[PDB]
Design a protein around this ligand. Structure first.
Ligand SMILES: NC(=O)c1ccc[n+]([C@@H]2O[C@H](COP(=O)([O-])OP(=O)(O)OC[C@H]3O[C@@H](n4cnc5c(N)ncnc54)[C@H](OP(=O)(O)O)[C@@H]3O)[C@@H](O)[C@H]2O)c1
Ligand SMILES: O=C(O)Cc1nn(Cc2nc3cc(C(F)(F)F)ccc3s2)c(=O)c2ccccc12
Length: 314
């Protein structure tokens, strides 16, 4: 149920995602999740719902359902706060919203810094994202300070390519190695090279968008649909499981952490019922065979940013 991180802490391999969970629904989602056994919640300031996630956690702590030490709460430093001077306040805002005194894991959400200011996606008049003059290593050093001050127990990265990870690993005077790299991963984007890289370096990989993010706001009707893939439905039927259950179990059997999102109580419970069956070797081979290098998350307006991660092969 949990994987050991480099700081000695254990991270639950199944967590609840919260991107696109409206504040109207995420409090109930998190309450239900905790009731049915989730102990890991994946959050971010940019998801605009951390206050409501926080309400749910506070309530369940107060109800004596769970103790804080049993929860594993992750959040992420948004791109507009990469300047060394902005990092601590960004973390403290997340902590205040979540009503917590520490995070279990805090990630650099994307390797790119954006122009500081109120807008999460500052654009120029021609639609290009406006970068900031920040660099990965200075942002990393700021993240390390959060560990040293007790705000966070572990730090990591998200959407970093292997060269960007290597930059941090090779930093003279590195204080903390990244514990986790959180990346998009599912049968249409199987990430074999980056997973082998990270796992060889002692970095745990978390798979995001494991169901293919059908609710992503830029979906096009001609896009591939993992949950509707008849090939994956057939593997699910053979196990008397749903397609979502197969898609969640798949990364678990690759020694990945996985964070499916739902706000629908029946699905939150369904998605956790993945510890009672095993995909066969042939199932795993078949699912890996569906790779198409297809990404849910890769914003066009960011493709000229100097730190855009997806020009590299991996
Ligand atoms: N680090 C990053 O850059 C990054 C990027 C993307 C995602 N993430 C994290 O990863 C999480 C998961 O990714 P995601 O939100 O993109 O998408 P996802 O988990 O792949 O898919 C969520 C979508 O699937 C639906 N769904 C959930 N369970 C289902 C089930 N059993 N049957 C049918 N449909 C089901 C949900 O609907 P309902 O909610 O309406 O039930 C929602 O529309 C995020 O929420 C976020 O926490 C991180
Ligand atoms: O962020 C999430 O969790 C999900 C996520 N993904 N995307 C796609 C992105 N593509 C990027 C590319 C870069 C780049 F590094 F390439 F510059 C930087 C930042 C991004 S956001 C979004 O546009 C988005 C908008 C609101 C809330 C969350 C998201």
């Amino acid at each position: 149920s949990r994987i050991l991180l480099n700081n000695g802490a254990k991270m639950p391999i199944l967590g609840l995602g919260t991107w696109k969970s409206p504040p109207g629904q995420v409090t109930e989602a998190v309450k239900v999740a905790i009731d049915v056994g989730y102990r890991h919640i994946d959050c971010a300031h940019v998801y605009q719902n951390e206050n409501e996630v926080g309400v749910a956690i506070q309530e369940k702590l107060r109800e004596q359902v769970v103790k804080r030490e049993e929860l594993f709460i992750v959040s992420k430093l948004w791109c507009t706060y990469h300047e060394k001077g902005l990092v601590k306040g960004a973390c403290q805002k997340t902590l205040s919203d979540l009503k917590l005194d520490y995070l279990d894991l805090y990630l650099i959400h994307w390797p790119s810094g954006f122009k500081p200011g109120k807008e999460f996606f500052p654009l120029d008049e021609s639609g290009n994202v406006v970068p900031s003059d920040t660099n990965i290593l200075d942002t990393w050093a700021a993240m390390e300070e959060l560990v040293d001050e007790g705000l966070v127990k572990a730090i990591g990265i998200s959407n970093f390519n292997h060269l960007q990870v290597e930059m941090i690993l090779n930093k003279p005077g590195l204080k903390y190695k990244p514990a986790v790299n959180q990346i998009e991963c599912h049968p249409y984007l199987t990430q074999e090279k980056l997973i082998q890289y990270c796992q060889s370096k002692g970095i745990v990989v978390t798979a995001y968008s494991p169901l293919g993010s059908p609710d992503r706001p830029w979906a096009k009707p001609e896009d591939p649909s993992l949950l509707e893939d008849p090939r994956i439905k057939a593997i699910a039927a053979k196990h008397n499981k749903t397609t979502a259950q197969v898609l969640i179990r798949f990364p678990m059997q690759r020694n990945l952490v996985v964070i499916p999102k739902s706000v629908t109580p029946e699905r939150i419970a369904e998605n956790f019922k993945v510890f009672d069956f095993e995909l066969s070797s042939q199932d795993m081979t078949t699912l890996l065979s569906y790779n198409r290098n297809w990404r849910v998350c890769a914003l066009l307006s960011c493709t000229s940013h100097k730190d855009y991660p997806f020009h590299e092969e991996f």
